[PDB]
From Swiss-Prot:
Range within the parent protein: 131 to 190 of 400
Name of the gene encoding the protein in the UniProt record: PHF24
Domain of life per record: Eukaryota
Identification of the protein by name: PHD finger protein 24
Source species: Homo sapiens (Human)
Zn finger limits (PHD-type): 1-60
Lineage, broadest ranks: Eukaryota, Metazoa, Chordata, Craniata, Vertebrata
Length: 60
């Protein structure tokens, strides 16, 4: 799970997730000009403990 915009993982709680395929810092997408609005649930993240980690490829 290496941010295609940074390339550095940790554990704290990266986003969106890791299972998907790639990671994107909630700030990168905004710092790059990719997304421009509420493109998620912004209700909970957690890059581990079960949860509703939604993403572009997630779907779930
Ligand atoms: Zn990044
Ligand atoms: Zn995902």
């Amino acid at each position: 799970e290496m941010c295609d915009v940074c390339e550095v993982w940790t554990a704290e709680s990266l986003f969106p997730c890791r299972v998907c395929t790639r990671v994107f810092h909630d700030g990168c997408l905004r710092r790059m000009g990719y997304i421009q609005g509420d493109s998620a649930a912004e209700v909970t993240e957690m890059a581990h403990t079960e949860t509703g980690w939604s993403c572009h490829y997630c779907d779930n």
